[PDB]
Structure formats: structure tokens, C-alpha cells
Amino acid sequence: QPAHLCFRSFVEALKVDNDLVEINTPIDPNLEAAAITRRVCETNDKAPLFNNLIGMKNGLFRILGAPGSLRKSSADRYGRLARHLALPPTASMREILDKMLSASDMPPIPPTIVPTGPCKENSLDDSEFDLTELPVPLIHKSDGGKYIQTYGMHIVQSPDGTWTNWSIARAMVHDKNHLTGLVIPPQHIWQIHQMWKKEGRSDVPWALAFGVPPAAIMASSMPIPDGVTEAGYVGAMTGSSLELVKCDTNDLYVPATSEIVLEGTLSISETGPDGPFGEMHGYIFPGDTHLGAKYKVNRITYRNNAIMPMSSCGRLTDETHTMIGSLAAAEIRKLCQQNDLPITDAFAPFESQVTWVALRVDTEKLRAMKTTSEGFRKRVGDVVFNHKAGYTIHRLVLVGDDIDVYEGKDVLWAFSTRCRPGMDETLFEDVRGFPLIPYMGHGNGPAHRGGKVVSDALMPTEYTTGRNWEAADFNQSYPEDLKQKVLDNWTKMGFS
Amino acid sequence: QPAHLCFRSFVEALKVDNDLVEINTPIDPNLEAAAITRRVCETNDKAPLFNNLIGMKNGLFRILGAPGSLRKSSADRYGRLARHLALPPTASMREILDKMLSASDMPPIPPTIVPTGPCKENSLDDSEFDLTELPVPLIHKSDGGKYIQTYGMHIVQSPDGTWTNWSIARAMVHDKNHLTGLVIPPQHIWQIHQMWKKEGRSDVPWALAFGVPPAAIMASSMPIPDGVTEAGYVGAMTGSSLELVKCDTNDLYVPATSEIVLEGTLSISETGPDGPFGEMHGYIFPGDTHLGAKYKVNRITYRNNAIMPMSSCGRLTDETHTMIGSLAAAEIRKLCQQNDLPITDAFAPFESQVTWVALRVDTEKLRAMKTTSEGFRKRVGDVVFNHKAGYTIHRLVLVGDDIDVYEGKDVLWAFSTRCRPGMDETLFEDVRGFPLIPYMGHGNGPAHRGGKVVSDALMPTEYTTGRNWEAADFNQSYPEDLKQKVLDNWTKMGFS
Ligand SMILES: Cc1cc2c3c(c1C)C(C)(C)C[C@@H](O)N3c1c(nc(O)[nH]c1=O)N2C[C@H](O)[C@H](O)[C@H](O)COP(=O)(O)O
Ligand SMILES: Cc1cc2c3c(c1C)C(C)(C)C[C@@H](O)N3c1c(nc(O)[nH]c1=O)N2C[C@H](O)[C@H](O)[C@H](O)COP(=O)(O)O
Ligand SMILES: [K+]
Ligand SMILES: [K+]
Ligand SMILES: [K+]
Ligand SMILES: [K+]
Ligand SMILES: [Mn+2]
Ligand SMILES: [Mn+2]
């Protein structure tokens, strides 16, 4: 099958790209695999495939780290993401985000049920597995559990059957047949869990599929709208119906080529300790445990020689930046456009630890609105910060047409030189806040509310008559013929 | 003579370092020399020495561009600055700033008058030069004049003779025997000019020396205290009295080895058009001229084969970032310490276009103060923003002991993840503002007041009991033996 539709083929694509290191000697899942992976992420090296994981028993399991991290080159920087989506490895972030947005005005292509698939090659019942005996990684030294779930897809369905949600939320091993993890508002897993809690009759039928189709894990990490089944959106984006098989112990459906599938329930009544965990913003607060969601596992099915993907998340750059940040920015871009705001592009600068989104403004359109910074700031902020897709984002930076928002250096320059602190910003204190940002959940204020800002880096004439400067750079402060002469003579004169 | 005491020897040091390209074919001072220099600055290439400048007549003049810009390597990144100060080329920013601060608690070493020097090898009276006939560069295409003065040192003395100030302020050619330029508060050239204006009897005796001792041009770009003669501070820092010769037409004294010296007066009554100019923040606003200071030139003296240094300033990275930003940060560091604030280090991140200063806090000391963020923010802000040394800086970022403020990536991470917008910041609206920042002089508010902020990126426990996190990075989230094993096995496993 194609790499974007089959995790095993995606692994073979990374090998063929020379973007994989296969480590066939024993590696310890207690910190070592994640430490290697962490180093890869901090240095944009090749993805590690741990074929010989101390503790692997009866085919459970190998580990692929850094599945959505960056490559060293500028030319194929986003190649690993492109391989999730059947895009060329040289694809730009604009092209990747466009691809992820493309299904938003297509009819869904619902999944196809098939009788069986590779995820059924092996199975373990209630009496044959113990989750504490599998080689689940300890990802960071102070983590409060072994985080089995960093790159699988939780699958839950509304009680009425009309919406089936696929998402990534973390989970750790609690005991032999339970996980715990984060199920928090406004996330769809939480929205669905609320539905089942209000019905009050049963625990939520659940499955967790690891090593799913790469196009599916990307949609899993994207805040597509409420009520939209991710399977049909992936189908539309890929132009192909995804093949799913039914779970053995419940009536949910999992991708046929899933590497590892857990089947069971998410409790509407029980909780258990989760955390702390070394998280996307680059921190772990040791000892910081909180009661979370509790999942019971009834059954494990898996492929022969199953591979568990893993995110060793933290400081720059990993899946939590490349996927959470970029995919939220993509949804925000569309959200603004649908609210008649003249936004052309959006990206979450890595330099901001993906807590900022930069919004590129079509200033011709802005000038026709005949508005002001204060007015426009408030309007953008109300649209974004009151919507789920702005959940993780605490600062919006508005920039004109000259700035490439996919270039953090240019975003920083515009922010630093065009936005007057205070005067050019509007604070938003009565919006939902992202408590995982340390200044929120470990900060001076309410963990779940406020701390958000819109920073206007549009200059005054951008609202009226048009840009009235040229940059003092090589590109803009010298005529074209001169620039060309200088470039043509550069090595001749003696430069690098 | 030594490179830090003689510009001609500094040029020969850059050659010997393989940090110079000598361009011996004709180069046009109308944009081409500055366009080459601009490209060098944007790419951290070797400094260009234009030995064959179209228009050079009777030894006036060659041009050295990018004299204080960055080298490509990390190891000798600041090598060109180190060569200003007799430091090893591998010196750190901490070492350079320490050197620049070292004279602050030394007795001055006043200059030594000598009868003559190289700057007297050639001279031109009132009837033998015309400033419009020299090969003065047009640095950016929309500049409002040919900026002769981008890296020379203005020399003015208080009417009572007790304080002789050396500083860099821009100036452009106005006519055959006059320059115009910026003389603005709170700069010492302005403070002295005010003294002469209030006496009301004569224009200010003035000289402008280009290609001065490299240690002198660094002090020229530093906001050392009011009333302190830069010559004696340089003497103390270098451990040697600087040799000066008297001007021919006035009683000021210039460095003996100055490449080019203009002698004349700064008017207490006349103004003339200055600007626009492509400036440190990365912008030029074409057409934006304002009346500035007017200088009359009575005499030119110069070395045989004189060399004019030039800053082609604008977007990152040039002298306006490496020198204005870093040297203000150095003075701010000391200012805080003298006000009993527990600041260990200060730097102006290049990513902020040197409009921010990051202040590293000794948090052991902070905890003994038993204070709060709001209190501490206000106190730091009042000390810095009400003092000349904070003039150019609009945002202060307070960070704990784990952050290296000389690393912009770590400053950005701390700012983005530890400072809650609004709640963790104090705005300062009744302080002098830096009008050259586009959001000030071309912004929505008063050009000369406010727009400043203190952003507290100290976490709450840093004020009380101590840091309560570990970073989720390779360094902090894995024990030492593991990290070493991983590094030892890195290339063996197959990584880069
Ligand atoms: C790619 C990726 C995304 C997420 C996470 C991770 C990765 C790697 C972890 C490594 C496990 C870290 C963890 O903090 N994590 C995570 C999470 N969302 C949660 O509610 N809870 C979580 O613990 N998201 C983000 C969500 O996947 C997106 O917000 C998505 O939009 C949700 O889907 P939906 O609710 O919109 O359907
Ligand atoms: C290194 C350097 C410093 C400065 C400048 C330049 C360079 C290269 C220009 C390229 C010419 C750009 C110009 O904007 N410029 C400049 C200037 N100060 C001014 O009042 N006016 C100016 O036009 N400074 C900064 C001052 O040199 C420092 O603020 C110094 O502290 C002043 O000395 P003092 O008043 O403290 O004695
Ligand atoms: K999703
Ligand atoms: K603005
Ligand atoms: K000075
Ligand atoms: K803070
Ligand atoms: Mn969803
Ligand atoms: Mn001074």
C-alpha cells in the first residue's frame, strides 16, 4: 500500500529516503530509546527505528521515534510530514497545510469496512497480556508513568453513532489492564466523553490504534470541526476511502493496517493518576500528578513484528511543534477566512514554542474595511480565542503582506519593530487558556482562563494608504541590476 | 602599533585572520560598496576593503565595510569585535562586555598629547576640498543624502573644558563644507550642545575622526556615564594612555593615527535637512526628512592612503546590533548591580532587533529579597527606563539562572513559556521612548514617550523556594551516564 495509507510502508519510505537509522542492537525502553530520540529531535537527525528493544516479547514491540520531526536540510525540512500525505519531500509548509485543509470543502469519503487486516495477525485476551510487562518507554526521567501513548489515535463515537472522533491525547500505563491520561476540555475526546457521562448508562466504548495510516495520524492531530468524523475527512483529502476493520470486543472500527490496537473502555466514573510528563512547552514539573481519565484494556491485537511510534517530546523540535502548532495554525487560517477576515496565511513560529500564531493579512482588503488597529485586533481575537482551534495559542501576531509567516526570523523582526507594547495589543482575559503552558498552569493567574493577546504588527498606513517604507536589506534597498551584478561577481571578488 | 590602538593595524589584523576581502577593481560608492557590505552583513562573510573606489582623489579615500560585523563560525563569531579590544578572536560576548565594563571602577588614564601623527600626513583647507566631490557612499537607494559618517567619532567638549565626549552619531553631506545629522536627547553630543546653546556665545568647536583606534570606537558606541571623558576610560580599559594630536584649526585633540579628521563647528543656531536613512531596525521611510544639526567643516587632515570605515546598516547583522545593542546591555547590567538589583548578565537579543534586553537574575539573591513579580518588575523598570543607558531598549525580559541570555533561542523560549502576557508585565508610558523604532516614530502613539515594558519570565517559585521543574531536553531529562553512553555510541549507531 502507499506510505500515507500504511504505517509499515511509511517506515520503508523513510528508509528509502535515507531518513531512518535502524538500530538492531539492544536498546532499553527505560529512557535510552527516548534519549536517542530526543537527541535526534534537537538536532534534526534521521528517525530511529529500534528493532531490538529490551523487553520485547511475542512481537510486542519495536519503536519508531521522531515520526513527524524535522530533517536537517532546508530543502526537505518537512519531508517526514510530506511522507504522511503523499506529497513530495520538498513540499513547503504552505503545501502541507493546504493539503490538510483541502478536505474542508469536499464531501467526506466515508470509510470502507473490510473483514480483516494486518492488525489481526496476532491477538491477546484479558488473561494473556499485562501492560506492565510490555516494553513501554519511560520517556523522560521524572515522568510519572511509562507513556505508551504518544503517537496513537484514540477512537470514540458519540452515543447516537453519528460522529466518530480520532485524536491524539497522551496516556500512560496505570496497571496490568488500564491506562490513565488527559481528557480535557475543549478536546473532542472530552466532548464525546461528556455525552456518555450525561447518558449515564455505560462506559465509553474505546479503542487506541498505534501505527495508523500516516494521513490519519495527521488528521488526528488537527482541530477539524466539532461533529466531523476524521475518517471521512482523511478519505476526502487522500481521494480514497480508508479501509477499517471491526474491533473484536466492541463495534468500533480501526484502520486495517494498524500496528497495534488496544480495545476497551473509557470510564464515565473512574479516575486515576496521570503525569507529570515532559511536555510540548519544554518542561516537566516533578511530582506534579493529577487525577485523569481511566481506560480499561480488554484486548490487544497487532501486526507481526509490530512497530510502536513514539514522540520524545519537549524542547524544539518534535511532533508537538511540527503537528500541534502547524495544524492549529492551518485551522485558524481557515476560521478567519470563513469569518470574513482578510487572512492569507497562518503559522505557529517554532521560536514561540508554538504558543504564538502569526497571521499574514491581505492589506489591500484591510484598507477596504476602513478600520483601525484596536477594532481589527478585537475582532480577530474574538473569532480565534473563542474557538477550539485557538485553544493552544496565546499570542496572535498580525503582519502585512511583506512578511513570510513560515519564517520565524521575519515574524520576530515584524513583531519587535512594528508592534508597540501595550498600545498596539489587546489582552483577552475571559477566554479559555491552555493550562499546559507553564505561565498558565504553574503561573501567577488562573490556570484555565485568560493570558491571551493580540499583537498588531501592522503599521499605521497599512490600514489607510499602503506600506510607506522599504526594508533596509539587500533585497529592497538596491536596484535589481546592481543586486544581480553583485551576486554575479560575488565569488570573483573573493566572497563565500 | 597594536590593532586595538591603530585602525591601520586593525585592517592588517583582519587580513591576517583571513577575515578581509581586498577588492582592488573599481567599485562605485553610489550604492555598490554598501550593497556588497550589506550582503556581507546578512551572511556573516569577510569584511570588504574597497581599495579602488570610483571617485577617490588625492588619497581620499578607500572604504572598509562591516568593521564590527559577525563572522560565519560559532567559534570566532565575535572575532571582529575581539580585534577591537586585544582579546582573543574566540572571545565570548561575556568576555567582550566585561572588557568594555572593566574601566568603570578604574581610575581613568588620561590621554597623552603628541606633536604630530599619521592623521597629519595630508591636509586640505577651506579652499581645497569639496565634500560633494569626495567618494562618499550612498548607502541605501532611498537615503536622503550620502552618509559620510557611519563609523567615525564625533568629538565635542563642555564649555568649561572638563568633559570631552566621543560618540557615534550619523551625519550626511549637506554641501561643499557642511554636514547635517542627528543630535538628539539624551545623547551626550546633545547634552554638550545644550550647554553651548545656553551660553549662547559661539558655535561648538568640533571634530569628527574616522578610522580611530578600535578601542576608542567601541567606547564611542557605549553609553558610559554623563561627564566621563571616553579617552580616559579607553586608557584604563587598555592599560595605556591614548596618544592624541591637536587639531590645526581648533584646540580639540584627535587620535594621532586617525585615518581622516574633519575640523570645524557644530552650530548652536543653524539646522539643515537630514534623513531619511536605512536604520538599525531594518527600515527606511522614503521622503522622511527632518531638520537636524548642522556642522561646518573648515579643514580635512588625513593619512596617506586613508581608509574610511562604513556601516551598511539595516537588517541583521551589523554594527548597530553588535555594538549599540550589546554595549547598552553591558551598561544596563552594571546599572542594575549598582542599584542593588541581583542581575548577573544582560544582552540585547539579535532576534529582537536589539530592542529587548534580557536580564539574567541571581535567583538565590532574589529569594532573599522576599518580593513579588509586580514589585520587582516595577523596580527594575524604573531603574532602567529612567536612565540614558535604557534609551534604545523597549522590552526587558527577566529570566532565572538556567537561561543563557547570550543565546537568543533560550531567551525566546523563556519569554514564550514563562511570561504570561499582561499579568506578568508592567507597561511604562511615562519614560523617554526611542523614536527610531518604527512603532514609535512611525507608529500610533507619541514618538518620544512610552511604549516600554518589563516582561517577567521568572516563574513563581523562583521568588520563594526555588526552581521546581527540569527541562524536557536531552541535557536535563536523562541521567549523566545515559547521556554519555548515547553520545559515545552516536556515530556507531549511525547518526550524524
Ligand atoms: C501530535 C500530538 C498531539 C497531542 C499530543 C501529543 C502529540 C504528539 C503528545 C506527544 C501525546 C503530547 C500530548 O500533550 N498530546 C495531547 C494532545 N491533545 C490532548 O488533548 N492531550 C494530549 O495529551 N495533542 C493535541 C491534539 O491531538 C490536538 O489538539 C487535536 O486537535 C485533538 O483532536 P480533536 O479533539 O480536535 O479531534
Ligand atoms: C555603532 C553605531 C552607533 C550609533 C549609530 C551608528 C552606529 C554604526 C550609525 C551606523 C551611524 C547609525 C546611527 O543611527 N547611529 C547613531 C547613534 N547615536 C546617535 O545619537 N545617533 C545616531 O545616528 N549610535 C549610537 C551611539 O553611538 C550610542 O548611543 C552611544 O552611547 C552614544 O555615545 P554617548 O552619547 O553615550 O557618549
Ligand atoms: K482530530
Ligand atoms: K502596530
Ligand atoms: K560614548
Ligand atoms: K512569570
Ligand atoms: Mn475531532
Ligand atoms: Mn559619553
Residue numbers in the entry:
A (entry chain A), B (entry chain A): 4 to 499
Could you share sentences copied from the article?
In the UbiD enzyme family, Arg173, Glu277, and Glu282 (A. niger Fdc1 numbering) form a conserved ionic network.
There is a slight shift in the protein backbone from residue 274 to 278 compared with wildtype; this allows the carboxyl group of Asp277 to occupy almost the same position as Glu277; however, a slight rotation of the acid group leads to an extension of one hydrogen bond from 2.8 to 3.3 Å. Similarly, activity for E277D can be detected by both UV-visible decarboxylation assays and HPLC, with a kcatapp of 1.2 ± 0.2 s−1. An accurate value for Km could not be obtained for this variant, as it does not follow Michaelis–Menten kinetics.
